[PDB]
Amino acid sequence: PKRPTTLNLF
Amino acid sequence: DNNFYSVEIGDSTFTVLKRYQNLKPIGSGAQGIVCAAYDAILERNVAIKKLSRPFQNQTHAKRAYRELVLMKCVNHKNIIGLLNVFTPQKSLEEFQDVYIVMELMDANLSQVIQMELDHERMSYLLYQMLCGIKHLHSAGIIHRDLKPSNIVVKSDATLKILDFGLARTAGTSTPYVVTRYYRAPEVILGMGYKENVDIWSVGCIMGEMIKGGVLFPGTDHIDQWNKVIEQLGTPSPEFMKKLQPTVRTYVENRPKYAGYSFEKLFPDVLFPADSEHNKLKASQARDLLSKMLVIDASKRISVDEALQHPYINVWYDPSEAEAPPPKIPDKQLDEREHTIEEWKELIYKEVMDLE
Numbered sequence: 001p002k003r004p005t006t007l008n009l010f
Numbered sequence: 011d012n013n014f015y016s017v018e019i020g021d022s023t024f025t026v027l028k029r030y031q032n033l034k035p036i037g038s039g040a041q042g043i044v045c046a047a048y049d050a051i052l053e054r055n056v057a058i059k060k061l062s063r064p065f066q067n068q069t070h071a072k073r074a075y076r077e078l079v080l081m082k083c084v085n086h087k088n089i090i091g092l093l094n095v096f097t098p099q100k101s102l103e104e105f106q107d108v109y110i111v112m113e114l115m116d117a118n119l120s121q122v123i124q125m126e127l128d129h130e131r132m133s134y135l136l137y138q139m140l141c142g143i144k145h146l147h148s149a150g151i152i153h154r155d156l157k158p159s160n161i162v163v164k165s166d167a168t169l170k171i172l173d174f175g176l177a178r179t180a181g182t183s184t185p186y187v188v189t190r191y192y193r194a195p196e197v198i199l200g201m202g203y204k205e206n207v208d209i210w211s212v213g214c215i216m217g218e219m220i221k222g223g224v225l226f227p228g229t230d231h232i233d234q235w236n237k238v239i240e241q242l243g244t245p246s247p248e249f250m251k252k253l254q255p256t257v258r259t260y261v262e263n264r265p266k267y268a269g270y271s272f273e274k275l276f277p278d279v280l281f282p283a284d285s286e287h288n289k290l291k292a293s294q295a296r297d298l299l300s301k302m303l304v305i306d307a308s309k310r311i312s313v314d315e316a317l318q319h320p321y322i323n324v325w326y327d328p329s330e331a332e333a334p335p336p337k338i339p340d341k342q343l344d345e346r347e348h349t350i351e352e353w354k355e356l357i358y359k360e361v362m363d364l365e
Contacts, residue, residue, distance in 0.1 A: 001287055001324050004131050007167040009117045 014098040019045060024060060025098040026109060033058065040155065040175035040187070041073050046114055049093075055114040056093055063106045064357060071353035073175040074108065076344055078360050080151065080174040081110060083336045088142030090115075090162070090170045095364045102358050116165050119158035123218055128282050129290035131167065136216055137317075137325045138169040143212070144313045146171075147205045149335040150179050151344075154203075156211035157192045158218065178344035180204050190234055191224050195245070195305045198235050199257050206310045213302030220280050220295070225303075236264070238305065243269020245305045272296040294321040 016025045019035050022043060026033075033045040042059045049056050064074030081092045094111035122135070139161060146153055153160075154176045163169045176187060182202035194210035196203045217225035226241065228234035239245070244266050250258055276299060281292035298321045301311040316322060317331050348356065 001130065001285075001290070003325065004134055004167040007122075007131065007163060007165050008125070009121065009163070009165050 022060070024058070024109075025107070026058060027094075027096065030056070030058060030111070037159075039077075039173040041070055041077070042110075042175070047111075049111075052093075057112045057114045059110040059112065061108040061110070064108060065350070065354035068347065068353075071348070071357060072344075074357055075342065075353070075360065076177055077110070077174045078108070078357065078364065079338065079342045080177055080336075081112075082364060083338055084145070084174075085336055086142060086145040086333060087168070087330065088138050088170055089145060090172045095361060097358075097361050097365075102355060105354065105358050108357065108361055113170075115162035115168075115170060117163055119161045119163065119215070119219075121158075122163060123158060124222060126282060127219065129285050129292075129295070132216075132219055132282075132295070133290055133321055134167065134325060135163070135169050135219075136212070137322050139171065139212060139215070140313050140316050140322065141330045142169075142171040143208050144317060144331060145333065145336070146177065147208070147313055148333075149338055150205075151177050151336075151338075152179065152181075152203070152205050153177050153208050153211075155188050155192070156208055156215065157189050158215060161215070181207070183345065186231065190228055190231060191226055193231075193234060194307070195235075195238060196307050198231070198238070199253060199261065201252060201254070204307060206307055206312050209302050209310055209313065209316065210307075212316070213299060216295075216299060217276070217303065220276055222280075235261070239264060239267050239269070241269055241275060242303060242305055243267045249306045272300045275299075289320045289324050291321070294319075298322065 013027060014025050015028050016023060017033055019033055024033050024045060029049055029051045030047040031050055033047045036046050037044045039059060041064060042061050044057055044059045047056050047058050061074050064070045091113040096109050097105060097107055099105045143153060160172045161169065162172055185200060188197055192211045192214045194207050196207060214225045226237040228237045250262055253261060273296060276296055278292055284291050298319045304310040317326060
């Protein structure tokens with residue numbers, strides 16, 4: 001299970 | 011000519027090192043106003059918290075000290091980074107203002123609450139919040155005011171906690187300084203508190219993330235208690251017994267409530283599709299919510315357990331979760347009264363040391 005490396009803050 | 015310089019931000023004056031440029035207003039802490047700024051030397055954004063004559067007052071100085079001290083010795087990828095501290099004034103006689111420079115994240119949790127996280131995101135953010143908090147607790151410090159606007163994130167999905175003005179060791183010893191909606195029962199009803207007071211806040215925050223809105227809105231300090239019991243149902247008598255007698259009467263007088271189940275508090279519609287693999291499940295989330303959001307503190311899960319909880323521990327990494335505690339110079343004990351002037355000197359030495 002991979003850690004996310006993105007988060008959409010737009 | 012000189013080292014510092016001045017900009018008016020609305021009605022407020024920021025006097026800072028010339029390295030710091032293009033201040034913009036962004037916020038406030040318990041104490042303090044905060045600007046974003048360019049650090050022309052490191053070539054990056056930062057945040058500059060101004061504290062105005064913090065020695066003005068028992069309160070202001072206590073908090074200022076704590077925040078100075080804690081910002082220094084704390085060391086974790088999930089706590090906000092110290093970068094700098096100063097004061098433009100040139101002597102204990104001159105001395106009046108403090109500035110703290112910090113990493114600038116991208117947004118606070120505001121911000122995330124309205125967007126629809128996948129489980130892996132939601133769980134990961136919590137996981138990070140908890141590592142942060144396990145760091146603080148590991149040295150016996152309680153944040154006390156966790157809440158979306160004190161938690162910041164970055165678009166690579168990392169997360170840190172912020173503001174240590176209210177942070178200190180375990181409770182008893184003034185009520186209305188924690189933000190209404192995140193007040194644990196122990197805090198609402200005036201019984202004093204242990205570290206898992208922070209757990210309550212985490213539960214509210216998590217709940218907010220899923221709920222899309224504040225978990226226990228609460229139209230004033232007393233109504234707050236209504237919102238809690240309306241949802242979780244009436245605490246046990248075993249719990250009532252621990253109340254001070256004056257507060258106990260009010261409480262036992264409240265209308266009784268069964269409260270909803272977490273299944274009804276937090277139904278599937280609210281959650282994203284369940285995970286590819288196993289533990290990232292709505293029901294597992296429910297299960298964690300149900301051990302955090304628990305009125306009776308002595309029945310409430312700790313951070314350690316929360317890290318072990320199946321919904322969270324899928325990211326578990328000991329070098330993040332079991333790092334050495336911050337070392338606090340044993341001087342600072344988050345309680346002792348001092349004076350108009352004793353404080354003024356404490357902070358100054360403390361800024362001086364840190365400059």
